[PDB]
Structure formats: structure tokens, C-alpha cells
Amino acid sequence: QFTAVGKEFNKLERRMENLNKKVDDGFIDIWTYNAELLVLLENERTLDFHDSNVKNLYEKV
Amino acid sequence: KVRDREGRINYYWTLLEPGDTIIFEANGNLIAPRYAFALSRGFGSGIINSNAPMD
Numbered sequence: 828q829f830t831a832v833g834k835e836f837n838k839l840e841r842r843m844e845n846l847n848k849k850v851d852d853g854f855i856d857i858w859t860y861n862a863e864l865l866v867l868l869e870n871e872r873t874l875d876f877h878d879s880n881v882k883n884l885y886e887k888v
Numbered sequence: 889k890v891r892d893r894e895g896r897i898n899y900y901w902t903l904l905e906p907g908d909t910i911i912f913e914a915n916g917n918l919i920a921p922r923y924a925f926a927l928s929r930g931f932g933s934g935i936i937n938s939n940a941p942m943d
Contacts, residue, residue, distance in 0.1 A: 829931075829932065831931070831934050832934075833934055833935050833936060833937070835935075
């Protein structure tokens, strides 16, 4: 995805500055979880995939 | 005194849409424009704060 992040707020705008912060951090939060989980969950699935393929060949013979 | 000035100049801006007309009425204290900017726009641009050198 194309990226654009840099948003600037004045002194009497810290309510919006904090909503921008809420939004910026909120999305990094979801994505860091989403990537970190799929990497752990599918490494598990790749490791079982092999030891099944091996057995499914030991049986072939 | 900000930069040795007790008096100040407030800066203002607008974007005259194609076809529109800008009229300036005054009897004093106007810091009139000299050069303007007739922009084209197009995203894939932004403001970045960096120390790092260009290559």
C-alpha cells in the first residue's frame, strides 16, 4: 500500500492530535497482532504438513 | 518582541477556483500579494521530517 502518515495539529487542537494518534497506533496494533499470529499459526501448519507427507509416503511403500 | 518586532503581520490564504475573481478593498495596513501559485495537484506526495541526506 501507498503510504501517507504525517498530520500536524496546533495548540488548541490536541483533541484531534490524540485521535490521529489513537488511529495511527490502533492500526499498527491490529497489523502487528495479525502478522505475528499468522506467522506462528502457519509455521505450525507447515511443520505438520511435512511429517504427514513423510508418513503418507512410508505408507505408499 | 519576536525578532525585534512589537508590531506583527498576520498571514492569510485562499484558493481561487478556476473562473472565480479575488477583490481586495483597503484604506491601509494591507500586505498585498506579489507572486501567486497556480497549482495542478496529484497525490503520491507528502511532508516528511528528516535529517538524512539526499543521494
